[PDB]
Amino acid sequence: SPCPGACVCYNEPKVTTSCPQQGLQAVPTGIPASSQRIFLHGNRISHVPAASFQSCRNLTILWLHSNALARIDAAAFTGLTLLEQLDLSDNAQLHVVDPTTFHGLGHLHTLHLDRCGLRELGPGLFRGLAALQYLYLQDNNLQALPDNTFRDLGNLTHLFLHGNRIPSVPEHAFRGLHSLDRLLLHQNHVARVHPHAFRDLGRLMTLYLFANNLSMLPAEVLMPLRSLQYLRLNDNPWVCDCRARPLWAWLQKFRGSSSEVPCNLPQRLADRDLKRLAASDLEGCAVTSQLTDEELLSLPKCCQAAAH
Amino acid sequence: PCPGACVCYNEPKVTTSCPQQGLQAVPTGIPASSQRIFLHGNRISHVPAASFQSCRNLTILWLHSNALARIDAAAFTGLTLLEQLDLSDNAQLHVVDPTTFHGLGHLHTLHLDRCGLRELGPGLFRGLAALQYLYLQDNNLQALPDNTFRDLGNLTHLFLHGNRIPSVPEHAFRGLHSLDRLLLHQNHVARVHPHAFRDLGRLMTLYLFANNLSMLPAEVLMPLRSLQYLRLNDNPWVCDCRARPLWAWLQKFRGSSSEVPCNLPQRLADRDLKRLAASDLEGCAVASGPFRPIQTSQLTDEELLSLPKCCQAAAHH
Amino acid sequence: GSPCPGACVCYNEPKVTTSCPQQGLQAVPTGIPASSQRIFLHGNRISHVPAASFQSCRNLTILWLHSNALARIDAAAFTGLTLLEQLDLSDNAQLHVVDPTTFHGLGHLHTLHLDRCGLRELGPGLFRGLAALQYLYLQDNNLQALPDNTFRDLGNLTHLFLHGNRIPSVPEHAFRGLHSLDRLLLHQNHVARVHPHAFRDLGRLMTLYLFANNLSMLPAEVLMPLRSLQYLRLNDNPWVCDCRARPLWAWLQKFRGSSSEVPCNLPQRLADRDLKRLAASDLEGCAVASRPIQTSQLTDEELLSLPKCCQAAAH
Amino acid sequence: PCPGACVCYNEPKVTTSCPQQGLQAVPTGIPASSQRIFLHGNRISHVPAASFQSCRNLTILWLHSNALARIDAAAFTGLTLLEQLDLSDNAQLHVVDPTTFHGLGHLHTLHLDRCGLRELGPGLFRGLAALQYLYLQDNNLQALPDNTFRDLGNLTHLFLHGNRIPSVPEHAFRGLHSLDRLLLHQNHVARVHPHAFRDLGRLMTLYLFANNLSMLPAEVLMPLRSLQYLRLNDNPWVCDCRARPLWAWLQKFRGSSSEVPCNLPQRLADRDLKRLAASDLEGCAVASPIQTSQLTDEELLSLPKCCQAAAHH
């Protein structure tokens, strides 16, 4: 019954404790235990200690974005077995989340972790979140997409990873994401997508890969994407020589929608859209042609053969 | 001995035919060997259990356009050779007992349109594994519960237009793996659950026009691999970020579709979603709640929760 | 109506019951309470069951009509009885025939007693749609055949009683559909042969009675689908212990379950020997029905109708 | 820092051990890195959600032989690395909230015996796909609801003896396809549904002794293809017509079984059913001494089907 001074409390449609943008630097004491939704966003809260909301057993929505979170205790969400939506975004100094923090939240549907200065995704961080549908991880400081990071997320439909520093997509980065509809990887440092990286993405409808470091994309990697409707590939250093031939053909047959695929090399094809190129425009190796054998091994197969 | 108000003959099937004779009840003395009985266009109001009990070989029963107020739950129990049952155009019938069709394993067509039906009780279509045509249009249905058609694995046609169905839950159409044509137009459909059409891999025609769809998840169309024709006009489509998945689906789809006219935002009013470019679909156009012409920036976080996810993303950043 | 019929006793516990057995009733009594869940009319002298004889008793689950004087059952006798679970029509020896559509629509029927009803045949469609049926009693009738697909809808049937009839053989598809059958009683008939693959659908069968019949041989291959077999009775059959008995002999050696004795009727040298206890070398040559008649003097038509090993013999 | 009543050490696993210290509450200050906690033999009465919340890596929790009156539904929610949970010998616990074990997808053993349990609530064992050992013996259970163990695809041992289970319904043991050992002795089991053991194809050992079975359908034993040892003694077996299916099964079964002593009729008292001949099983021995001929058709409805046949002849 006693509502905290910084807060407004009401009962319909859900029991709500709302205290946003009140300059709070700590979670207010005396939050009604029957709260189903708690809005603490836009304050200056620095920490989330253990069991900060433990009495609110019926909590389904916890809003904590745009604070000054520097640390979240691994036991911060004790008691919140029914939590469905958790927004922790826009806390640029958070940097790290203990890998066990979200454990046991089997009702979680939405998790906002964007703009949290996250340096890495720890092992087990998203384990057990079988009901999760939306995962926001964009605009962090991620430098890797480790294998099996999303392995338990069989119900995930939306995965937002744009605006990090992801250098590549390993084979099993997206293992287990059989329900994924939308995958956004634009504005990273992706220089390559491993073969079979999209093996589990039979339901994917939308894939953004623009503003990355791709010089090539084997058509074979796109072949599991049988539900694909929309593909974005612009602003990549595409090399339109022999290595572009598979992607070129795939683009000709694909009935969905796609962006331009502008050539960056060779110079004679600069600013040409690959989709509009004739097959005979794709010749030789672009990369100076005589190289070290170790460097020759690092080039596409058609370049190694073009030397011969 | 043929009833006075009737005409009886034996080929091609034993038939008792007495339509539009102003009959106040089912006539007595219908030949027990009857296979086809045409009693439509009369003034019959009840069908007790004993009415057709002697007609063991009955396969076709026509009772449409009568004055049916009631059908006994045991009216057809022993008549399991029944193949076609037309009970339509009896507007005051209002309700059919959920056990009325149990055991009719040879039934192929069931007409229940224009019967003022208020609801489909649990188990109404249970066990009808041979049913091919089901007419339920122009009734007073206000709900399409999960598993209503669970056993209709052989149904090819399902008519549901002209009711007041407000939404399609996830398992409303579970089990309909033979369905070819599904007509849901002229209802109040405001939303379709993303996996509502999971079993409709053979569906060729789908009507959803004249409803209340502000958006349709492209995900719900994805299982419709046999789809050839899709009707979507006369819905209040919102052509903002929420329309992006459907927009892409419409570009790739090789079958035929109606226009998808944008209702909001105003700058895109009467534009066709099919003809829009991706860049046209940016941001959020608030089409729900009180204070109806409103900017997303003016909405609390709590208010944003009722909007599409992509609207929430647009408002915050 | 709600008052109890004169010849009856009515009570509510445990189920609403109308009980009028052995009252000398010649017809179904009027005024049986519509709320009846159970009706006992056995041991009277009821001569027929006309259309809708109990149609108001919508909650009826048990209808007892055995040991009456039924000469006819109207095809629509059981109108209204959608919830009927146990129907006992047994011991009406002058009934002779049931209209093939009489039980149609009785989807809750679990038990059906039709034994000792003088039944001359099982009409096409007689047991159609009885998906819940578990017990079917057909013993001590006058059945002269088991037509194909007679039981094809009886997927939940566990007990089938057919003894004391005049069934002459078991055709290939007689028992199609009986995937749940546990006990099959076929004794005291005239079974001269069991068609190969006749037991194809009886993988759950635990008990098979074939004694007091006219079997001269049983291919071991016909028993092979019976993976659940526990008990097999085969006595009182004119078993012929020649070359034709070799497969059954081998089967009996390996069989881990229980079986009766299998007494040899021919040849005379092995008369009344138990096939189970014979050595394989005791099984030789071919003994035709018949002084023993040689294969050598037989017609080719007759020869073709003998077991394969007999045809091979003397050839 | 190790709590005064405890001993703490690192190898082989980080362990906090404080058993039999007369503790009335879970000690505060248990090291967060604890993988194993031994608090058995104390007098602990409550387990609030906060108790073990900081022990994120907790794998083994021993709480047996305490005074538990209550376990909070959120007591283990975040501790999803739990593999062994021993809550046994807390006779006043009586109820475990149906959500208590949700999300424990690494749980391998769960001890709930001697907890005075009155019921198993819906969803109590939901999602425990890793569970191998489940102890539920010596409680106060009066029913085994359908689908109680539906998700326990990896369960090998299930102990249910010493309860008051009156019957086994058709789908009580649905889902238990890895089950090796099932102990149901010392209950009140009067009947087992014919298809109750449908999913128990790997079952090797079945204890049904000290119950109230007057008969057991052979049909229920048929799917038990791996069965090796069956205990059936100390039941009031009726060796009349209703025993014929079990009689035959007993003749064919090549694993081991206890004696199956007849309780009725008097002429076969204390005889082993396994040793009887088929001719010894005839007619109906009515539980009362009442003749079969004297029985009304109404009364016969509550008897085995073969008794109805033996009565009417």
Ligand SMILES: *[C@@H]1O[C@H](CO)[C@@H](O)[C@H](O)[C@H]1NC(C)=O
């Ligand atoms: C949660 O909701 C339930 C059901 O309305 C209620 O009984 C319970 O008291 C609530 N819990 C809290 C902590 O308010």
Ligand SMILES: *[C@@H]1O[C@H](CO)[C@@H](O)[C@H](O)[C@H]1NC(C)=O
């Ligand atoms: C995932 O979504 C499906 C519906 O698509 C739902 O039935 C299921 O309960 C959800 N959760 C899990 C763990 O499958």
Ligand SMILES: *[C@@H]1O[C@H](CO)[C@@H](O)[C@H](O)[C@H]1NC(C)=O
């Ligand atoms: C990736 O591309 C950016 C331009 O968008 C460039 O500045 C950067 O050096 C590239 N990095 C690598 C590793 O190629």
Ligand SMILES: *[C@@H]1O[C@H](CO)[C@@H](O)[C@H](O)[C@H]1NC(C)=O
């Ligand atoms: C129904 O059809 C069967 C077979 O054609 C026939 O024997 C019977 O007389 C017909 N009529 C009735 C009322 O059963």
Ligand SMILES: *[C@@H]1O[C@H](CO)[C@@H](O)[C@H](O)[C@H]1NC(C)=O
């Ligand atoms: C469905 O229809 C086909 C022919 O259209 C038929 O062969 C099949 O038996 C029907 N299925 C059922 C379950 O009756």
Ligand SMILES: *[C@@H]1O[C@H](CO)[C@@H](O)[C@H](O)[C@H]1NC(C)=O
């Ligand atoms: C649906 O739209 C029609 C016209 O477009 C309107 O008359 C009706 O009120 C709407 N229904 C709902 C529930 O908003």
Ligand SMILES: *[C@@H]1O[C@H](CO)[C@@H](O)[C@H](O)[C@H]1NC(C)=O
């Ligand atoms: C059958 O039982 C139902 C519910 O017990 C009752 O409402 C109904 O009146 C009964 N029918 C008759 C004919 O008594």
Ligand SMILES: *[C@@H]1O[C@H](CO)[C@@H](O)[C@H](O)[C@H]1NC(C)=O
């Ligand atoms: C047949 O038996 C199965 C197994 O007990 C049961 O689930 C099913 O409901 C039964 N069928 C009918 C029609 O009663």
Ligand SMILES: *[C@@H]1O[C@H](CO)[C@@H](O)[C@H](O)[C@H]1NC(C)=O
């Ligand atoms: C059937 O067996 C009996 C044995 O009592 C025998 O009398 C009868 O002739 C046999 N029937 C045939 C057709 O051989």
Ligand SMILES: *[C@@H]1O[C@H](CO)[C@@H](O)[C@H](O)[C@H]1NC(C)=O
């Ligand atoms: C759990 O173990 C990991 C190492 O696997 C360690 O980094 C972490 O600090 C441990 N957690 C606690 C609360 O001790």
Ligand SMILES: *[C@@H]1O[C@H](CO)[C@@H](O)[C@H](O)[C@H]1NC(C)=O
């Ligand atoms: C079940 O057991 C198998 C074999 O021991 C194992 O591979 C599997 O991981 C187990 N399941 C779980 C959920 O641990």
Ligand SMILES: *[C@@H]1O[C@H](CO)[C@@H](O)[C@H](O)[C@H]1NC(C)=O
């Ligand atoms: C079996 O039931 C009887 C009374 O019905 C009871 O005395 C006996 O203790 C029961 N058996 C067991 C093992 O509890």
Ligand SMILES: [Cl-]
């Ligand atoms: Cl609440």
Ligand SMILES: [Cl-]
């Ligand atoms: Cl804010």
Ligand SMILES: [Cl-]
């Ligand atoms: Cl903290």
Ligand SMILES: [Cl-]
């Ligand atoms: Cl959500």
